[PDB]
Design a protein around this ligand. Structure first.
Ligand SMILES: Cc1cc2nc3c(=O)[nH]c(=O)nc-3n(C[C@H](O)[C@H](O)[C@H](O)COP(=O)(O)O)c2cc1C
Ligand code: SF4
Lengths: 1004, 1005
């Protein structure tokens, strides 16, 4: 038969494969109208009714992210200097740093950075109104693709940390609890357990206070986050987690106790010996209006303070004791108001069963209080918005509300707002919910704050800088002070106050505090993991250092690097005065190795830079000053001589005399190629010259541009090197413009020469070189260089046989502060090895569960294996099946931390551990074969697996023409190409063949 | 002697905003925060209640517009789906996957060619299509957090670049010559109405070869609504003109001032005068009207959309008319009645005319708005007010001006039927009322001219929805007049559908039949006649692109499909003698980690531990015979491998030659015995080559590994040994990486074992390019087949420029599929074509020179703006706005397209081979006298400070970064190292210029 033609079955399997067309298509406008609905993913602008939402408390936020989505977006962020997003965060979170840790897969380092400045970091990730805060200042707003999803990035990192189940701890550098001065034992009260108090009590705890007590009116803690923000925007378990974090530091919570004249008052606190008090009780009561005088919830009337807690209590498991049921809401619902609260009233009304919801405002669309992302929630649930209407009368017939009469309003001159009594609207409805805001009105509570001063707004008056009321020992914060109306501002009030509280307590015990404010960061057991390592007789405080390169151009930069925490550094390579060089320019260019992506995370650089332009005398003096001031940081002098015995002997004694802890020999000079480093016998001889000139250790810097790097490592060891650095850059050319001229291009003649490629493009090459040397020379020290940009990539080199990790391109891409991500990242990776119940994880990434857009797919009987992708009529059936399960369920009414159960490994215990899995081809099994399996619930229906198997594989995948779901068939050979191009992490997995493996021989 | 390793005061000060690790939580009061937030704000302020002044401001407001930076990013994001749902959702069935693929490859010609093949109004549509109700509505990436592709922005970008090249449309080159057509193609054809429907209809008829096509148009202007009503700030008139001029390139004739109407043109008069077929494309020419407005005039303040939108257009669209023309002076409060596209365009245009305030008023509610959300959004962001549930009752006129309109509340019953409530009124003050209820066909003399075609229930001409034929067989109709659609693209498609059956009908009237299968022709330009063939080692390649010996050539059945798609040549997967037959493991091909955790399209490398073919030599030799028999012009190169054994290489090469391969390729991966592979030792390569040469007479190429100290020594040995060329290069030995627990990937067996593998793809391109360059330099004229990370026409041209003759591809196919060959071909043609165009030498290939932009829209060239140090945020952005507005008002008080011709002949491939080698040389051949310094275009900056951070911690501390404006300035410390330019997210925002000042190296001591 014709071997080069597909048989009919394969022809059939290929029916949807791309082919190029030679004619333009012909399809009628009506055929297209009728097929359009089949493929539709997004809401239909003609569909005027909202999906059945009754009892559905599923997450509706547009900003939620999963791991895949979070990595892409973290990689997009430009990680800006003096970032404006941080300037616009009310708690000043280091957004650059924490997004940088997410792009490095260091979710622990991200969460630590978030929680250091915001103890309610997960709450704020989910509910912050970022368009009015950090995101509205984002530089990327100036690009077509727009600002970064900061809130969803913050929420993703925090959720991972929550899932790691790691406790907060006391600051490891406080004195012991026994040895704290007596002032720390002072009795502190906080009133109210909302964000402001939670934050305030957190920060005092970090400073060392051991007797802190929050007093909360309700049986439940968390404030509005618990009692009013809907479960479908803020899950109750997020609040419980943040509270338990705080209780890890010893804060006590006593429920059932009120700030109120017959109960707790400032005078009673004074008499029981409390030394300071923080008022965070919020605004307990609803703003009301005479025209609703005396209407009951039976008749149909709620205030927002009556309604939202009813819903929250029955949707939020573990808010209270009781099970309560969802409020019976039926018919047409009018919500009065235009803020945050009115929009949560509207959407929570649909969850209780409302048929129609009307939002009615005093002014126009243009004037809506709330943020646009909050409005869009109501909008997409098809709430109707009625502007320019003020309520006048509620109509009650038969004991029930039946309508509300409004008058029309208009702005005049001045923009003066006037009601027009002649122009009326009679709006039929069954339930009315006023969402006019809130106030503190209860005279028993105002009198319990006696004697503190109140202002014109009838709120406690505070100094905006210190949060102190008129009584110096009483502070206040949050909604009750009336400047904040976000969670993150109330968090910030409690943080602001904590410092001034501390100042006041210390001064009451005769003690002074710093003039510069110093709130402690956030800490966990992770932070105590030891990541020091010892190599060739040096002790490194951590394994990360600056390679010999552009970041070590001047000794002042090394000095700043050591101040950020880098463990070690190489000088740029320097030489004898007779060999001094002069750079050309341009000389460092971006890598074209991942296509036309500009900005952060360049996958390579090319350089035609020569060695250092500064003299040996600058560098020698500089190593002396650096070793004097940083005795515990390793300094390594990189040196280069022509192939001359006296020169190498001179220059290495000089650099040793300066106090260098070690030397690094740069074998790039010309002299099996052109470089002394490409010829084993020249390597061995240069190393012998140096070995007998100096007593300190030295390392040969090996080039990867050789047939066999092992022969060059062995030569160095035979020459007397104490180790080898693997590897220098890869020889390369980064490309040409369309007209033929290169880049870089030097001078009038647009000339260039071959350069050195660095960055994550060469990491495969250096990893091979490190593992080849480690297998051939067991025990011989290796310094790794080549594409290390994270703790995670560093650990791959460690596992391969390296002991320390040299970095260049990742700093050129960013700045010296990535060391703090690298150190936290590596502590977390090692710590996580000791937790038994997280062994399903890859490093810091939890095992991927089936998601759609990073939201868990519903685990419902009636929905599995029944072939319903998330578009067209299929999606409509999904939502109908989901809606019925919510209804079925309504008719069917503890946080404990993981403890390590094995010692945490030190660097010395992981070095080399991958080598065991490496060997020859003949050591791999050809009996244990695999096949691809596709999780249809994760697929986004692109058909890339399909096309790759078609045109680079075995034609083994069927792509359904109506559902666009792929199925791997039994002709799969396990090549793994499909898994490798799929856009969804872990949507395709390889599993073991059950069936027998026969190779396709074409002809037997 | 002072402290060398510490920064002097000056530099400590330049470093003041550099990032530093913080060791404490920050303290900043809520008050200070509120106070500071406004300084940095980029986006609309939610507590700001009127929008900036727009008067006389016709600048682009579209949110979908893209510059080249942004387009390359968004194109690389598209998954380029099989059977893509976005295409199913486009009424003209554009091949979005192909045209986005082309954009990501920098082939803006092949993208525009793909768009215009299916849509002659491709630029207009890109700018105005309501994509959320069409193609983007169906996009698969909607199931990701970042969302669906900006397909419309991408369409508009490639179309704009194509407009910039000034290339004309040509009649299809493979058609007979004009003098050689059948008589039927001279049939006189008539189209009524120069709008999208007829332009598209006349375009496709002319592509089919009809020589005598006239559009008769009522007005003095052309373009229908795209000219007279869509605003200039959404659709610039020059775009309409460009697409009409493309049509006129095929000889379509346009006559203005001639109407379908009683006593002018009727179907009867066309029939008498010999016209053989007519297309009715006149749209819905009259406004839909309310009795409550009868008798109101423009001087009282009343307009319908049909009077008002053309008055704004004649004023703001340069030479729509030969009339100059002042804006309507629209002052005070404006009421616009309606909820479709028309009303939102009246609302936004009224602000350009000076309206203080605009009310859009609807009969129903916000839920029932007819425009798509993107169109609503434009009126929302300009602070129009929306009033729902009002129906108009009375217009009050005092002193000859409208002063108010009285409405009644509407509401919805118990059945969805829509009643008014007489006791519930709204009296809304206003000075101008603009009726936007839509459009109609009312004119009795127009309808009479269409006698006798049947009219339907809606009083519109009845057509069959498949054929667009009226009840008279020679008369077809399409577009708004049919009543089915109201988008540009659907009208374009009506005219497209009709043109096929019009052809079918005319051909029947002259006695000929047409295909059962519809066959509308593509779009062609002279770019398509470029020759990209090339001859190497005596073989003629129809184009230089071929499939490497690899995964895409696992089966000969795949090579067949590749040739069908157009690939110039292909290798077999490497095969051996029966005694050498291998068995692969699995898993064995893994995605690269070389560009981080990015998944899906465009992997930057792969790693494989795959062996040579598991199919036998018989299979491959019989296969080469069938392939050569069915594809005698496509080149088949048998790739072979033996151990180090003379009889074996001779037996197997003779078997492959006797199968009829055009050439052989020796895979020197094999072990025996300067490495383990034969390919790593020049002596063995020499001997193997000699052996093969004495055995066969066909050409043969040696495939080199890059895993050598000196690839030249190996190439040279293959040449000494007799080979006709070399293939440079095979994969690079690497280890793709480990999982955090130390296991590898791939991992084989329950042992999780692995071995070194080969890296392919664009990550290894700099290595392959250096290899190609260095052989081409040392062995000039010795043919080179290039391979390593070639994935576009642009990067294939780099290799040709560097000395290769033909270009092998593997990873770009694994990343996509065999159809990229269409993109590579049209891309190479366009690159070669552009070299002959004098007016376009500032471009780099198909990339215009970058113009200073924000979000890819051009920066107003106003001198009061130039160098005032006003970044685009906070209070500086408010000042930019005040200056641009005052300029627009200055302009208010002071009231030709011909194609470029090649001036050289168009280069052939052999003319460009090697041309980059004249720039390569040793290091000592570079000037260290001719130094540069970086220079920053503050107008392009996005204030990120990455240049600043790079120069501080990797450079010379030479940039100042302003603490209030976050503008960088480069100082005279600059050495030109060029790292800032390389990290800048904005293309061409930093440029290197010749050092003017004194260049002294900084020596420390
Ligand atoms: C899965 C796979 C299999 C390959 N098989 C061979 C082969 O059998 N013979 C060979 O000579 N080169 C083989 N190659 C190397 C390719 O032919 C090509 O040289 C390499 O992938 C570089 O081109 P690219 O960067 O376009 O992929 C293979 C590459 C891959 C990814
Ligand atoms: S806390 Fe809120 S404000 Fe701050 S960065 Fe986060 S999301 Fe933004």
């Amino acid at each position: 038969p014709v071997l080069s033609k597909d048989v009919a079955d394969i022809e059939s399997i290929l029916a949807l494969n791309p082919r190029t067309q030679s004619h333009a298509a012909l399809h009628s406008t009506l055929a297209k109208k009728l097929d359009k609905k089949h493929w539709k993913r997004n809401p239909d602008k003609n569909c005027f009714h909202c999906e059945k939402l009754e009892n559905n408390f599923d997450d509706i936020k547009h900003t939620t992210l999963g791991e895949r989505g979070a990595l892409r977006e973290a990689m997009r962020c430009l990680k800006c200097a003096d970032a404006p997003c941080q300037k616009s965060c009310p708690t000043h979170l280091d957004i650059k740093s924490f997004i940088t840790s997410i792009s490095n897969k260091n979710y622990y380092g991200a969460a630590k950075m978030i929680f250091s400045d915001n103890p309610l970091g997960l709450t704020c990730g989910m509910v912050c109104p970022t368009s009015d805060l950090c995101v509205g200042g984002c530089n990327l707003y100036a690009t077509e693709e727009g600002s970064i999803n900061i809130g969803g990035l913050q929420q993703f990192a925090s959720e991972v940390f929550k899932a790691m189940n790691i406790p907060q701890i006391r600051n490891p550098c406080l004195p012991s609890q026994e040895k704290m001065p007596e002032a720390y034992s002072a009795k502190i009260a906080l009133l109210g357990a909302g964000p402001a108090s939670i934050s305030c009590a957190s920060f005092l705890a970090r400073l060392g206070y051991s007797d802190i007590t929050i007093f909360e009116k309700q049986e439940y803690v968390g404030g509005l986050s618990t009692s009013e923000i809907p479960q479908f925007r803020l899950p109750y378990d997020v609040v419980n987690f943040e509270i338990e974090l705080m209780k890890d530091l010893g804060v006590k919570i006593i429920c059932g106790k009120s700030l109120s004249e017959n109960e707790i008052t400032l005078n009673t606190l004074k008499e029981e010996g409390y030394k300071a008090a923080f008022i965070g009780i919020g605004l307990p009561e609803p703003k009301t209006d005479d025209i609703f005088q005396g209407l009951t919830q039976d008749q149909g009337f709620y205030t927002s303070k009556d309604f939202l807690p009813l819903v929250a209590k029955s949707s939020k498991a573990g808010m209270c004791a009781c099970h309560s049921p969802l409020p019976s809401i039926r018919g047409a619902v009018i919500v009065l108001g235009a803020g945050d609260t009115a929009f949560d009233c509207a959407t929570s009304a649909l969850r209780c069963g409302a048929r129609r919801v009307f939002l009615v405002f005093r002014k126009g669309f243009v004037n809506i209080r709330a943020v646009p992302e909050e409005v869009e929630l109501a909008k997409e649930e098809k709430c109707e918005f009625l502007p320019f209407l003020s309520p006048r009368k509620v109509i009650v017939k038969g004991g029930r509300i039946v309508a509300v009469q409004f008058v029309r309003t208009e702005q005049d001159e001045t923009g003066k707002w006037n009601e027009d009594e002649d122009q009326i609207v009679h709006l039929k409805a069954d339930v009315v919910i006023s969402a006019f805001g809130s106030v503190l009105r209860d005279p028993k509570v105002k009198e319990a704050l006696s004697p503190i001063k109140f202002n014109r707004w009838d709120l406690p008056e505070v100094d905006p800088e210190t949060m102190q009321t008129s009584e110096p020992w009483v502070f206040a914060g949050g909604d009750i002070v009336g400047m904040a109306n976000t969670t993150v501002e109330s968090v910030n009030d409690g943080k602001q106050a904590s410092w001034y509280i501390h100042k006041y307590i210390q001064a009451q015990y005769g003690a002074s505090v710093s003039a510069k404010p110093e709130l402690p960061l956030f800490y966990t057991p992770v932070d105590l993991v030891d990541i020091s390592v010892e190599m060739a007789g040096l002790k490194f405080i951590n394994p990360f250092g600056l390679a010999s390169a552009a970041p070590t151009t001047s000794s002042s930069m090394i000095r700043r690097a050591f101040e950020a925490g880098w463990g070690f550094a190489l000088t740029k390579t320097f030489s004898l005065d007779k060999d001094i060089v002069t750079n050309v320019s341009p000389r460092i260019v971006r890598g074209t190795t991942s296509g036309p992506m500009y900005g952060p995370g360049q996958s390579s650089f090319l350089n035609i830079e020569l060695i250092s332009e500064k003299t040996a005398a600058y560098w020698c003096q500089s190593v002396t000053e650096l070793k004097a001031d940083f005795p515990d940081n390793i300094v390594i002098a990189s040196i280069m001589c022509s192939y001359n015995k006296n020169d190498w002997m001179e220059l290495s004694r000089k650099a040793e005399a300066s106090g260098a802890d070690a030397l690094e020999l740069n074998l790039s000079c010309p002299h099996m190629g052109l470089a002394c480093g490409q010829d084993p016998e020249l390597v061995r001889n240069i190393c012998r010259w140096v070995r007998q000139a100096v007593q300190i250790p030295f390392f040969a810097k090996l080039t990867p541009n050789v047939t066999d790097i092992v022969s060059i490592a062995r030569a160095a060891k035979e020459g007397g090197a104490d180790g080898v650095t693997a590897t220098n850059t890869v020889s390369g050319l980064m490309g040409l413009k369309a007209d033929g001229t290169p880049w870089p291009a030097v001078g009038a003649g647009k000339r260039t020469t071959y350069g050195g490629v660095s960055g994550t493009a060469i990491r495969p090459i250096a990893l091979r070189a490190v593992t080849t040397i480690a297998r051939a020379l067991p025990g011989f020290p290796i310094l790794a260089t080549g594409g290390i940009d994270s703790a995670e990539s560093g650990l791959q080199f460690l596992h391969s046989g390296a002991s320390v990790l040299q970095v260049c391109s990742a700093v050129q891409n960013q700045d010296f502060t990535v060391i703090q991500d690298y150190c936290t990242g590596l502590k977390a990776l090692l710590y996580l090895k000791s937790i038994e119940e997280l062994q399903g994880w890859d490093g810091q990434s939890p095992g991927t569960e089936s998601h759609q857009k990073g939201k868990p797919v519903p685990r419902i009987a009636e929905l599995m294996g029944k072939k319903l992708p998330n578009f067209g009529p299929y999606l409509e059936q999904r939502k109908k099946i989901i809606a019925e399960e919510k209804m079925r369920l309504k008719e069917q009414n503890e946080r404990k931390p993981f403890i390590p159960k094995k010692p945490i490994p030190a660097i010395k215990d992981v070095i080399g551990k991958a080598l065991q899995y490496l060997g020859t081809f003949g050591e791999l099994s050809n009996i244990e074969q695999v096949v691809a399996v596709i999780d249809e619930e994760m697929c986004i229906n692109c058909g890339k697996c399909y096309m790759t198997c078609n045109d680079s594989g075995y034609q083994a995948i069927q792509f359904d023409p109506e559902t666009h779901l792929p199925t791997v068939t039994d002709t799969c050979t396990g090549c793994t190409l499909c898994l490798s191009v799929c856009p969804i992490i872990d949507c395709i997995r390889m599993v073991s063949r059950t069936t027998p493996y026969e190779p396709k021989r074409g002809l037997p």
